[PDB]
Amino acid sequence: VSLFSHLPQYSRQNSLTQFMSIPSSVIHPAMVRLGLQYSQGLVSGSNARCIALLRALQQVIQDYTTPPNEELSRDLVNKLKPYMSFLTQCRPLSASMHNAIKFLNKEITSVGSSKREEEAKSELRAAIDRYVQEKIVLAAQAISRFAYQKISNGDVILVYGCSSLVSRILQEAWTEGRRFRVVVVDSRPWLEGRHTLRSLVHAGVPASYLLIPAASYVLPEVSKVLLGAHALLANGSVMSRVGTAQLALVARAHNVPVLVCCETYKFCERVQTDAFVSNELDDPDDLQCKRGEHVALANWQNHASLRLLNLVYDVTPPELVDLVITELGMIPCSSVPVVLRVKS
Amino acid sequence: GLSCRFYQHKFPEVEDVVMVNVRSIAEMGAYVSLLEYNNIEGMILLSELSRRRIRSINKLIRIGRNECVVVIRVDKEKGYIDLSKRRVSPEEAIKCEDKFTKSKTVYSILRHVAEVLEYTKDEQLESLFQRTAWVFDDKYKRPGYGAYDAFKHAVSDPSILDSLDLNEDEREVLINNINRRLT
Amino acid sequence: MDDKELIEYFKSQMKEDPDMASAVAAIRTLLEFLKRDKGETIQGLRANLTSAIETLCGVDSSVAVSSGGELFLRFISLASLEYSDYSKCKKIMIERGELFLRRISLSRNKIADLCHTFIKDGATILTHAYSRVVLRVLEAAVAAKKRFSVYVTESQPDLSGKKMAKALCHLNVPVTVVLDAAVGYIMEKADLVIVGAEGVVENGGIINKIGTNQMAVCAKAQNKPFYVVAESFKFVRLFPLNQQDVPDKFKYKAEEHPWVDYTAPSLITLLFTDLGVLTPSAVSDELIKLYL
């Protein structure tokens, strides 16, 4: 597709460890394992990947030796770059990873050269642990406590895709002694809502399941819409998985409020005015349908004029969102920049 | 299961440094619970509210911590104690921590000793306290430290245990626990 | 003083001067309670003040009272208050409360001065119900040698619009009274809409007397400006979404007869507060700054 030809396309069946030496190499083995797991797709999620990367970085910082004359302050910064270039080669990064990169580089630079190696190592490990503890778990607990006040008996809540924060909030609210039922909507390049369906069924909550194109059929019954997010842009738009904007638009057409939950450490500084351009493409071979004998799109490379498109991200304007919940409270969507980054 | 005051006193005096664990945060002050004088409520007024600072915090990071605070005003009839934090010196905090640890160890070993006797309530625990440890610190005329050093010295000389009005049933368990913990 | 004395003082203060709002009466009663409290403790004083505020809110169900009490409590405690003596702290908070009371009584004139310049020459103004701040605004405007015409609504079920018109008569301005169901018919001739307020919410909307939502929708359907006059001590922490989410203790006063309704921020143009002139997006963080 010439429209999205600017973005690169990568396949998930290209082994990168074939030409690497077996008993360790320039790349630390922990990064090799992490990149292998990322490429195989065994670790998915906007928040688990950051934790795994930080754990690997802790492991590398544990095993380090200062050069005989060179100070570690610049040596570590120079050493870290090839590893994360390799990680980017394995799979494109996300906003949380970039923020963690910036914080870690700031911490590494800020250290003084008077201290010994062991003191610096201990301080860096303690700082990383403090960051992980403070910026993920406590924020989730505070967000759940804040959002508990907008759920009442007899409500019907609509969720899309899979998100850990939404499941945690719903399970805590149900345990607190509230009664309601949930509706799950799924798309069909991944089918990621089945995880949420299983978790909710196990928790003991009634639920319904359906596909995205029928969204207009069930919206007359719904009363609230709850959504997660991947990043927050400077102008106030919300970036998420493909299809969220459709749900927002149809809910607006049926007069249904929409709520968005996100953590404060995913705040970016980019500006975007359309749901295009800066996105990520995926493997086009997954769109092949397996319906009995009829298997179209097989060997689609034979036809010259046939193209398959696979987007991953979608930007939603702030005119279709009515409330945003963060660890600092609840605010209107248009007021995101005036509080999130005004502390600078 | 059991709970008893660390000292025979019921209320602290002025210019006293005490352990404190933050319980909840209100709009003007901090609701806290004391430990040495059992679970009793108290307020710490936030100087300047730390007002700009408090806007950007999760507001629940401070729940469940420990520090030393100084008592300024006391009202026995209602049960209200005024506390402060700025009026604290680190040298005093060192003795605060040391005394808290010593009292904690003494309380733990005494409670373990009384556990074997299986006190139904804490009234018998209070009687044991006033018959063994409170009388100890009264005889030594010093609070907290006297009982601790007496127990630490008795690990080699149990004869002093016979000086007090201690029954053999209590004495056996107490000697066993003292030689177990203190060693 | 006890609960009966509290209620007696509250009702007497309300009755003495009809030209006075509930918030000022609650603040004065709280100050009186502060000046007659005995004991040696801070938490005891806080508990007594909280109980007094609760028993005051119990008698009268209006939004402004609770916000005024909370703001009073927060404001009087924003100083050192460490010292060693109860009396010095008591005098300090008494002085702070007196200064706060002095500050409150200087907002209507500022609102009128800021808002009177938005009225054109020879214009038709539609308003709803009775509100003293709008009357002050119009008096200031007419003192500046301008001419205009005014429409009002009967405002069922207590017919306060007739009282508003009678008050407007002394200012020799042309005034008309229309039915409560003729708003859509009369919207064509109007030029701008000015209404009062009873409480400002987080997202920017307002809470007012029943019958404002339809006026706002009708004005939006024909592209007419919508203006709101409010006060600083009426900002409350609440994030309603629809008409159901309003708390029940404000809906029904002490067949359905609700007394108040909420209007969204997307149907409003400007807000004229004592802080200045704010777009609806500015309230979302001005409220955060205010509740220090």
Side-chain angles (χ1 to χ4, degrees), chain B residues 26-28 31 42-43 45 47-49 51-52 55 72-73 75 80-82 84 87, chain C residues 40-44 46 73-74 77-86 89 288 292:
Chain B
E27 43 86 10
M28 44 190 317
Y31 261 126
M43 195 136 290
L45 183 47
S47 164
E48 206 46 56
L49 295 195
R51 73 320 191 201
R52 287 51 155 160
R55 268 190 256 148
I72 172 156
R73 278 192 291 277
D75 188 6
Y80 296 146
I81 316 171
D82 269 359
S84 177
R87 211 159 66 184
Chain C
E40 178 57 273
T41 168
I42 271 46
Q43 321 70 336
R46 171 190 194 278
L73 201 56
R74 295 206 175 209
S77 71
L78 207 76
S80 172
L81 280 291
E82 205 79 41
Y83 269 39
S84 61
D85 192 15
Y86 199 57
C89 307
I288 295 180
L292 202 64

mmCIF file of all heavy atoms in Angstrom, chain B residues 26-28 31 42-43 45 47-49 51-52 55 72-73 75 80-82 84 87, chain C residues 40-44 46 73-74 77-86 89 288 292:
data_model
loop_
_atom_site.group_PDB
_atom_site.id
_atom_site.type_symbol
_atom_site.label_atom_id
_atom_site.label_comp_id
_atom_site.label_asym_id
_atom_site.label_seq_id
_atom_site.Cartn_x
_atom_site.Cartn_y
_atom_site.Cartn_z
ATOM 1 N N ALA B 26 -6.470 13.458 56.537
ATOM 2 C CA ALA B 26 -7.647 14.300 56.414
ATOM 3 C C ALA B 26 -7.274 15.600 55.711
ATOM 4 O O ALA B 26 -6.147 15.783 55.244
ATOM 5 C CB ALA B 26 -8.267 14.567 57.787
ATOM 6 N N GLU B 27 -8.240 16.515 55.639
ATOM 7 C CA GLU B 27 -8.038 17.762 54.914
ATOM 8 C C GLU B 27 -7.158 18.757 55.658
ATOM 9 O O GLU B 27 -6.629 19.676 55.024
ATOM 10 C CB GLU B 27 -9.390 18.402 54.599
ATOM 11 C CG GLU B 27 -10.381 18.366 55.748
ATOM 12 C CD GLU B 27 -10.226 19.541 56.690
ATOM 13 O OE1 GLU B 27 -9.486 20.486 56.349
ATOM 14 O OE2 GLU B 27 -10.849 19.522 57.771
ATOM 15 N N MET B 28 -6.988 18.611 56.971
ATOM 16 C CA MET B 28 -6.190 19.575 57.719
ATOM 17 C C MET B 28 -5.036 18.903 58.451
ATOM 18 O O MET B 28 -3.981 19.515 58.645
ATOM 19 C CB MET B 28 -7.067 20.340 58.713
ATOM 20 C CG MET B 28 -8.036 19.471 59.488
ATOM 21 S SD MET B 28 -9.229 20.441 60.428
ATOM 22 C CE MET B 28 -8.168 21.711 61.107
ATOM 23 N N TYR B 31 -4.439 11.672 60.934
ATOM 24 C CA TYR B 31 -4.927 10.789 61.985
ATOM 25 C C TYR B 31 -3.970 9.612 62.114
ATOM 26 O O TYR B 31 -3.743 8.881 61.142
ATOM 27 C CB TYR B 31 -6.334 10.289 61.660
ATOM 28 C CG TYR B 31 -7.455 11.027 62.352
ATOM 29 C CD1 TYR B 31 -8.503 11.572 61.623
ATOM 30 C CD2 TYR B 31 -7.473 11.168 63.731
ATOM 31 C CE1 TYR B 31 -9.534 12.241 62.248
ATOM 32 C CE2 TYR B 31 -8.504 11.831 64.367
ATOM 33 C CZ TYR B 31 -9.531 12.368 63.619
ATOM 34 O OH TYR B 31 -10.557 13.035 64.246
ATOM 35 N N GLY B 42 -4.454 10.041 67.539
ATOM 36 C CA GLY B 42 -3.782 11.320 67.651
ATOM 37 C C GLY B 42 -3.807 12.062 66.336
ATOM 38 O O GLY B 42 -4.003 11.471 65.268
ATOM 39 N N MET B 43 -3.610 13.376 66.430
ATOM 40 C CA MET B 43 -3.551 14.255 65.271
ATOM 41 C C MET B 43 -2.176 14.889 65.154
ATOM 42 O O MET B 43 -1.603 15.338 66.149
ATOM 43 C CB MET B 43 -4.602 15.368 65.342
ATOM 44 C CG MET B 43 -4.827 16.095 64.022
ATOM 45 S SD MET B 43 -6.550 16.387 63.591
ATOM 46 C CE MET B 43 -7.081 14.724 63.224
ATOM 47 N N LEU B 45 -0.777 18.044 62.957
ATOM 48 C CA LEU B 45 -1.141 19.134 62.065
ATOM 49 C C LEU B 45 -0.069 19.307 60.999
ATOM 50 O O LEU B 45 1.125 19.347 61.307
ATOM 51 C CB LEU B 45 -1.324 20.430 62.851
ATOM 52 C CG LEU B 45 -1.779 21.655 62.056
ATOM 53 C CD1 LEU B 45 -2.948 21.309 61.151
ATOM 54 C CD2 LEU B 45 -2.141 22.798 62.989
ATOM 55 N N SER B 47 2.084 21.351 58.871
ATOM 56 C CA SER B 47 2.583 22.716 58.780
ATOM 57 C C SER B 47 2.598 23.155 57.323
ATOM 58 O O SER B 47 3.181 22.475 56.472
ATOM 59 C CB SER B 47 3.979 22.815 59.386
ATOM 60 O OG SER B 47 4.621 24.014 58.989
ATOM 61 N N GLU B 48 1.943 24.280 57.036
ATOM 62 C CA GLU B 48 1.750 24.782 55.676
ATOM 63 C C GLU B 48 0.988 23.787 54.808
ATOM 64 O O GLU B 48 0.916 23.951 53.585
ATOM 65 C CB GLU B 48 3.089 25.146 55.022
ATOM 66 C CG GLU B 48 2.989 26.203 53.941
ATOM 67 C CD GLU B 48 2.128 27.375 54.359
ATOM 68 O OE1 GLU B 48 2.421 27.984 55.409
ATOM 69 O OE2 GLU B 48 1.158 27.686 53.640
ATOM 70 N N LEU B 49 0.424 22.754 55.433
ATOM 71 C CA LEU B 49 -0.259 21.645 54.762
ATOM 72 C C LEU B 49 0.625 20.890 53.766
ATOM 73 O O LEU B 49 0.179 19.902 53.183
ATOM 74 C CB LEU B 49 -1.522 22.137 54.041
ATOM 75 C CG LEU B 49 -2.670 22.684 54.893
ATOM 76 C CD1 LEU B 49 -3.947 22.773 54.072
ATOM 77 C CD2 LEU B 49 -2.883 21.832 56.130
ATOM 78 N N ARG B 51 1.153 22.149 51.098
ATOM 79 C CA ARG B 51 0.049 22.348 50.164
ATOM 80 C C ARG B 51 0.334 22.223 48.657
ATOM 81 O O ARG B 51 -0.381 21.486 47.980
ATOM 82 C CB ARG B 51 -0.631 23.696 50.482
ATOM 83 C CG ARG B 51 0.085 25.012 50.117
ATOM 84 C CD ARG B 51 1.591 25.012 50.368
ATOM 85 N NE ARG B 51 2.169 26.345 50.242
ATOM 86 C CZ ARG B 51 3.454 26.586 50.022
ATOM 87 N NH1 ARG B 51 4.330 25.604 49.892
ATOM 88 N NH2 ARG B 51 3.872 27.846 49.936
ATOM 89 N N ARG B 52 1.342 22.911 48.113
ATOM 90 C CA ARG B 52 1.708 22.637 46.726
ATOM 91 C C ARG B 52 2.182 21.203 46.556
ATOM 92 O O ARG B 52 1.840 20.551 45.563
ATOM 93 C CB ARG B 52 2.794 23.595 46.218
ATOM 94 C CG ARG B 52 2.405 25.056 45.923
ATOM 95 C CD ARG B 52 1.678 25.768 47.033
ATOM 96 N NE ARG B 52 1.842 27.214 46.956
ATOM 97 C CZ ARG B 52 1.033 28.091 47.535
ATOM 98 N NH1 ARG B 52 -0.006 27.702 48.255
ATOM 99 N NH2 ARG B 52 1.271 29.391 47.387
ATOM 100 N N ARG B 55 -0.448 18.210 46.124
ATOM 101 C CA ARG B 55 -1.294 18.124 44.938
ATOM 102 C C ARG B 55 -0.796 17.059 43.968
ATOM 103 O O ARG B 55 -1.593 16.438 43.256
ATOM 104 C CB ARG B 55 -1.365 19.480 44.238
ATOM 105 C CG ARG B 55 -2.530 20.348 44.671
ATOM 106 C CD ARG B 55 -2.672 21.556 43.760
ATOM 107 N NE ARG B 55 -2.176 22.777 44.381
ATOM 108 C CZ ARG B 55 -1.613 23.779 43.717
ATOM 109 N NH1 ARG B 55 -1.456 23.736 42.405
ATOM 110 N NH2 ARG B 55 -1.201 24.850 44.387
ATOM 111 N N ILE B 72 2.949 17.704 72.615
ATOM 112 C CA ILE B 72 2.964 19.098 73.035
ATOM 113 C C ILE B 72 1.826 19.426 73.996
ATOM 114 O O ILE B 72 2.044 20.094 75.012
ATOM 115 C CB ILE B 72 2.944 20.049 71.818
ATOM 116 C CG1 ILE B 72 2.754 21.498 72.269
ATOM 117 C CG2 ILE B 72 1.884 19.633 70.815
ATOM 118 C CD1 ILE B 72 3.274 22.511 71.280
ATOM 119 N N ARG B 73 0.608 18.970 73.706
ATOM 120 C CA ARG B 73 -0.536 19.258 74.559
ATOM 121 C C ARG B 73 -1.286 17.971 74.858
ATOM 122 O O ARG B 73 -1.356 17.067 74.023
ATOM 123 C CB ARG B 73 -1.480 20.279 73.915
ATOM 124 C CG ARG B 73 -1.040 21.721 74.088
ATOM 125 C CD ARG B 73 -2.143 22.685 73.685
ATOM 126 N NE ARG B 73 -2.393 22.656 72.249
ATOM 127 C CZ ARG B 73 -1.689 23.334 71.354
ATOM 128 N NH1 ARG B 73 -0.684 24.116 71.712
ATOM 129 N NH2 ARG B 73 -2.001 23.225 70.066
ATOM 130 N N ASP B 75 -4.899 16.329 76.898
ATOM 131 C CA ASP B 75 -6.200 16.476 77.546
ATOM 132 C C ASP B 75 -6.675 15.090 77.961
ATOM 133 O O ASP B 75 -7.080 14.290 77.110
ATOM 134 C CB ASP B 75 -7.212 17.147 76.618
ATOM 135 C CG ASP B 75 -8.509 17.492 77.326
ATOM 136 O OD1 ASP B 75 -8.584 17.318 78.560
ATOM 137 O OD2 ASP B 75 -9.456 17.939 76.647
ATOM 138 N N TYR B 80 -7.468 13.435 74.081
ATOM 139 C CA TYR B 80 -6.900 14.097 72.916
ATOM 140 C C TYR B 80 -5.446 14.445 73.189
ATOM 141 O O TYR B 80 -5.125 15.018 74.235
ATOM 142 C CB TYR B 80 -7.693 15.357 72.561
ATOM 143 C CG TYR B 80 -9.121 15.081 72.153
ATOM 144 C CD1 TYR B 80 -10.137 15.976 72.455
ATOM 145 C CD2 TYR B 80 -9.454 13.923 71.464
ATOM 146 C CE1 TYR B 80 -11.442 15.729 72.082
ATOM 147 C CE2 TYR B 80 -10.756 13.666 71.087
ATOM 148 C CZ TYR B 80 -11.745 14.572 71.400
ATOM 149 O OH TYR B 80 -13.045 14.321 71.026
ATOM 150 N N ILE B 81 -4.571 14.094 72.248
ATOM 151 C CA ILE B 81 -3.138 14.332 72.359
ATOM 152 C C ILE B 81 -2.684 15.110 71.133
ATOM 153 O O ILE B 81 -3.008 14.732 70.003
ATOM 154 C CB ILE B 81 -2.347 13.016 72.477
ATOM 155 C CG1 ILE B 81 -3.040 12.059 73.446
ATOM 156 C CG2 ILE B 81 -0.925 13.292 72.923
ATOM 157 C CD1 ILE B 81 -2.452 10.668 73.451
ATOM 158 N N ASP B 82 -1.939 16.186 71.353
ATOM 159 C CA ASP B 82 -1.392 16.991 70.271
ATOM 160 C C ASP B 82 0.054 16.590 70.015
ATOM 161 O O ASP B 82 0.867 16.548 70.944
ATOM 162 C CB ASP B 82 -1.477 18.481 70.598
ATOM 163 C CG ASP B 82 -2.758 19.110 70.102
ATOM 164 O OD1 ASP B 82 -3.575 18.389 69.493
ATOM 165 O OD2 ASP B 82 -2.946 20.326 70.317
ATOM 166 N N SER B 84 3.620 16.666 67.193
ATOM 167 C CA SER B 84 4.351 17.477 66.233
ATOM 168 C C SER B 84 5.535 16.677 65.710
ATOM 169 O O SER B 84 6.002 15.729 66.348
ATOM 170 C CB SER B 84 4.823 18.796 66.853
ATOM 171 O OG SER B 84 5.584 19.553 65.929
ATOM 172 N N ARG B 87 9.476 19.570 65.529
ATOM 173 C CA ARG B 87 10.216 19.753 66.771
ATOM 174 C C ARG B 87 10.879 18.451 67.206
ATOM 175 O O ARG B 87 10.702 18.010 68.346
ATOM 176 C CB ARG B 87 9.280 20.272 67.864
ATOM 177 C CG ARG B 87 9.944 21.162 68.895
ATOM 178 C CD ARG B 87 8.909 22.026 69.597
ATOM 179 N NE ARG B 87 7.989 21.229 70.399
ATOM 180 C CZ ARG B 87 6.949 21.724 71.058
ATOM 181 N NH1 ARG B 87 6.658 23.013 71.022
ATOM 182 N NH2 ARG B 87 6.182 20.902 71.769
ATOM 183 N N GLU C 40 -9.467 22.289 75.638
ATOM 184 C CA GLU C 40 -8.039 22.397 75.331
ATOM 185 C C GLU C 40 -7.680 21.226 74.419
ATOM 186 O O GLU C 40 -7.216 20.181 74.881
ATOM 187 C CB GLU C 40 -7.203 22.411 76.614
ATOM 188 C CG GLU C 40 -5.698 22.472 76.396
ATOM 189 C CD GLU C 40 -5.269 23.667 75.571
ATOM 190 O OE1 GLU C 40 -5.257 23.565 74.325
ATOM 191 O OE2 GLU C 40 -4.939 24.712 76.170
ATOM 192 N N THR C 41 -7.888 21.417 73.118
ATOM 193 C CA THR C 41 -7.656 20.397 72.103
ATOM 194 C C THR C 41 -7.946 21.012 70.742
ATOM 195 O O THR C 41 -8.712 21.972 70.629
ATOM 196 C CB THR C 41 -8.533 19.158 72.318
ATOM 197 O OG1 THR C 41 -8.478 18.319 71.159
ATOM 198 C CG2 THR C 41 -9.978 19.564 72.565
ATOM 199 N N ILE C 42 -7.323 20.449 69.710
ATOM 200 C CA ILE C 42 -7.630 20.844 68.339
ATOM 201 C C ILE C 42 -8.627 19.884 67.704
ATOM 202 O O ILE C 42 -9.563 20.312 67.023
ATOM 203 C CB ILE C 42 -6.334 20.949 67.505
ATOM 204 C CG1 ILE C 42 -5.720 22.353 67.585
ATOM 205 C CG2 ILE C 42 -6.591 20.586 66.055
ATOM 206 C CD1 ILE C 42 -5.638 22.950 68.968
ATOM 207 N N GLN C 43 -8.450 18.580 67.932
ATOM 208 C CA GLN C 43 -9.362 17.595 67.364
ATOM 209 C C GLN C 43 -10.772 17.767 67.911
ATOM 210 O O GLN C 43 -11.753 17.557 67.190
ATOM 211 C CB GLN C 43 -8.882 16.155 67.609
ATOM 212 C CG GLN C 43 -7.378 15.817 67.510
ATOM 213 C CD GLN C 43 -6.465 16.368 68.608
ATOM 214 O OE1 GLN C 43 -6.748 17.359 69.268
ATOM 215 N NE2 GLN C 43 -5.338 15.698 68.792
ATOM 216 N N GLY C 44 -10.897 18.132 69.187
ATOM 217 C CA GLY C 44 -12.214 18.417 69.728
ATOM 218 C C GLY C 44 -12.889 19.568 69.011
ATOM 219 O O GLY C 44 -14.079 19.502 68.689
ATOM 220 N N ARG C 46 -12.257 20.515 65.927
ATOM 221 C CA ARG C 46 -12.588 20.052 64.583
ATOM 222 C C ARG C 46 -13.864 19.220 64.585
ATOM 223 O O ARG C 46 -14.727 19.391 63.716
ATOM 224 C CB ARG C 46 -11.428 19.246 64.005
ATOM 225 C CG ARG C 46 -11.755 18.545 62.699
ATOM 226 C CD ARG C 46 -10.652 17.584 62.299
ATOM 227 N NE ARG C 46 -10.777 17.148 60.915
ATOM 228 C CZ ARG C 46 -11.571 16.170 60.506
ATOM 229 N NH1 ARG C 46 -12.336 15.502 61.353
ATOM 230 N NH2 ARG C 46 -11.598 15.851 59.215
ATOM 231 N N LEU C 73 -13.747 26.002 56.794
ATOM 232 C CA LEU C 73 -12.886 25.116 57.569
ATOM 233 C C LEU C 73 -11.477 25.076 56.993
ATOM 234 O O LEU C 73 -10.489 25.155 57.732
ATOM 235 C CB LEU C 73 -13.487 23.714 57.611
ATOM 236 C CG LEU C 73 -13.022 22.810 58.751
ATOM 237 C CD1 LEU C 73 -13.275 23.477 60.086
ATOM 238 C CD2 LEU C 73 -13.716 21.462 58.679
ATOM 239 N N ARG C 74 -11.365 24.955 55.669
ATOM 240 C CA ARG C 74 -10.041 24.911 55.054
ATOM 241 C C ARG C 74 -9.304 26.233 55.220
ATOM 242 O O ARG C 74 -8.094 26.246 55.468
ATOM 243 C CB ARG C 74 -10.156 24.550 53.575
ATOM 244 C CG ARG C 74 -10.697 23.161 53.319
ATOM 245 C CD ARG C 74 -10.211 22.627 51.992
ATOM 246 N NE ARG C 74 -10.630 21.248 51.782
ATOM 247 C CZ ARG C 74 -9.958 20.367 51.057
ATOM 248 N NH1 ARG C 74 -8.825 20.688 50.456
ATOM 249 N NH2 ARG C 74 -10.435 19.132 50.932
ATOM 250 N N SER C 77 -7.559 27.465 58.754
ATOM 251 C CA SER C 77 -6.470 26.648 59.274
ATOM 252 C C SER C 77 -5.182 26.785 58.472
ATOM 253 O O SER C 77 -4.252 25.999 58.679
ATOM 254 C CB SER C 77 -6.895 25.180 59.317
ATOM 255 O OG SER C 77 -6.981 24.640 58.011
ATOM 256 N N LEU C 78 -5.098 27.760 57.567
ATOM 257 C CA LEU C 78 -3.954 27.891 56.665
ATOM 258 C C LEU C 78 -2.977 28.920 57.228
ATOM 259 O O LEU C 78 -2.807 30.016 56.698
ATOM 260 C CB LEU C 78 -4.422 28.270 55.265
ATOM 261 C CG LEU C 78 -3.521 27.837 54.112
ATOM 262 C CD1 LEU C 78 -3.675 26.355 53.850
ATOM 263 C CD2 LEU C 78 -3.842 28.636 52.863
ATOM 264 N N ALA C 79 -2.318 28.544 58.318
ATOM 265 C CA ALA C 79 -1.285 29.377 58.924
ATOM 266 C C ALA C 79 -0.395 28.476 59.774
ATOM 267 O O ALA C 79 -0.454 27.246 59.671
ATOM 268 C CB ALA C 79 -1.903 30.522 59.732
ATOM 269 N N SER C 80 0.443 29.091 60.610
ATOM 270 C CA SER C 80 1.376 28.339 61.441
ATOM 271 C C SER C 80 0.643 27.428 62.419
ATOM 272 O O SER C 80 0.721 26.201 62.306
ATOM 273 C CB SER C 80 2.298 29.291 62.202
ATOM 274 O OG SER C 80 3.086 28.588 63.146
ATOM 275 N N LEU C 81 -0.074 28.024 63.374
ATOM 276 C CA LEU C 81 -0.898 27.281 64.333
ATOM 277 C C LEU C 81 -0.100 26.217 65.081
ATOM 278 O O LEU C 81 -0.659 25.220 65.544
ATOM 279 C CB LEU C 81 -2.114 26.645 63.652
ATOM 280 C CG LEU C 81 -3.357 27.490 63.354
ATOM 281 C CD1 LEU C 81 -4.049 27.874 64.648
ATOM 282 C CD2 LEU C 81 -3.041 28.725 62.536
ATOM 283 N N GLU C 82 1.212 26.408 65.212
ATOM 284 C CA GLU C 82 2.020 25.437 65.942
ATOM 285 C C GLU C 82 2.175 25.837 67.406
ATOM 286 O O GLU C 82 1.660 25.153 68.294
ATOM 287 C CB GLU C 82 3.393 25.292 65.275
ATOM 288 C CG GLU C 82 4.068 23.956 65.528
ATOM 289 C CD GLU C 82 3.521 22.852 64.647
ATOM 290 O OE1 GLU C 82 3.281 23.109 63.449
ATOM 291 O OE2 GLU C 82 3.332 21.726 65.151
ATOM 292 N N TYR C 83 2.832 26.976 67.648
ATOM 293 C CA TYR C 83 3.075 27.593 68.953
ATOM 294 C C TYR C 83 3.053 26.645 70.148
ATOM 295 O O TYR C 83 3.527 25.507 70.064
ATOM 296 C CB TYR C 83 2.062 28.714 69.183
ATOM 297 C CG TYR C 83 2.544 30.059 68.694
ATOM 298 C CD1 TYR C 83 3.255 30.170 67.507
ATOM 299 C CD2 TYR C 83 2.301 31.214 69.423
ATOM 300 C CE1 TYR C 83 3.702 31.395 67.056
ATOM 301 C CE2 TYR C 83 2.745 32.442 68.981
ATOM 302 C CZ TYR C 83 3.445 32.528 67.797
ATOM 303 O OH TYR C 83 3.890 33.752 67.353
ATOM 304 N N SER C 84 2.564 27.137 71.286
ATOM 305 C CA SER C 84 2.385 26.306 72.469
ATOM 306 C C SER C 84 1.101 26.584 73.234
ATOM 307 O O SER C 84 0.733 25.767 74.082
ATOM 308 C CB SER C 84 3.574 26.474 73.427
ATOM 309 O OG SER C 84 3.688 27.816 73.864
ATOM 310 N N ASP C 85 0.408 27.689 72.973
ATOM 311 C CA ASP C 85 -0.740 28.105 73.764
ATOM 312 C C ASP C 85 -2.011 28.053 72.928
ATOM 313 O O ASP C 85 -2.014 28.437 71.754
ATOM 314 C CB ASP C 85 -0.543 29.519 74.313
ATOM 315 C CG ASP C 85 -1.563 29.880 75.373
ATOM 316 O OD1 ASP C 85 -2.237 28.964 75.891
ATOM 317 O OD2 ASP C 85 -1.697 31.082 75.685
ATOM 318 N N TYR C 86 -3.091 27.574 73.548
ATOM 319 C CA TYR C 86 -4.376 27.492 72.863
ATOM 320 C C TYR C 86 -4.909 28.875 72.510
ATOM 321 O O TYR C 86 -5.477 29.069 71.428
ATOM 322 C CB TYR C 86 -5.378 26.746 73.740
ATOM 323 C CG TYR C 86 -6.579 26.215 72.999
ATOM 324 C CD1 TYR C 86 -6.428 25.350 71.926
ATOM 325 C CD2 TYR C 86 -7.864 26.579 73.373
ATOM 326 C CE1 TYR C 86 -7.526 24.861 71.246
ATOM 327 C CE2 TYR C 86 -8.967 26.097 72.699
ATOM 328 C CZ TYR C 86 -8.793 25.238 71.636
ATOM 329 O OH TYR C 86 -9.889 24.753 70.960
ATOM 330 N N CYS C 89 -3.523 30.576 69.246
ATOM 331 C CA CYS C 89 -4.075 29.931 68.063
ATOM 332 C C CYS C 89 -5.532 30.319 67.862
ATOM 333 O O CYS C 89 -5.960 30.589 66.732
ATOM 334 C CB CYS C 89 -3.935 28.414 68.186
ATOM 335 S SG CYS C 89 -2.263 27.848 68.556
ATOM 336 N N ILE C 288 -9.454 23.344 41.357
ATOM 337 C CA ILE C 288 -8.358 22.620 41.992
ATOM 338 C C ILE C 288 -7.449 23.583 42.740
ATOM 339 O O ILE C 288 -7.028 23.314 43.871
ATOM 340 C CB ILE C 288 -7.575 21.806 40.945
ATOM 341 C CG1 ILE C 288 -8.458 20.713 40.346
ATOM 342 C CG2 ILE C 288 -6.332 21.199 41.563
ATOM 343 C CD1 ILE C 288 -7.754 19.866 39.313
ATOM 344 N N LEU C 292 -7.254 24.468 48.276
ATOM 345 C CA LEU C 292 -5.886 24.191 48.678
ATOM 346 C C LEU C 292 -5.865 23.247 49.873
ATOM 347 O O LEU C 292 -6.786 23.241 50.688
ATOM 348 C CB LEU C 292 -5.154 25.488 49.013
ATOM 349 C CG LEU C 292 -3.631 25.423 48.944
ATOM 350 C CD1 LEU C 292 -3.184 25.130 47.525
ATOM 351 C CD2 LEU C 292 -3.028 26.723 49.441
#
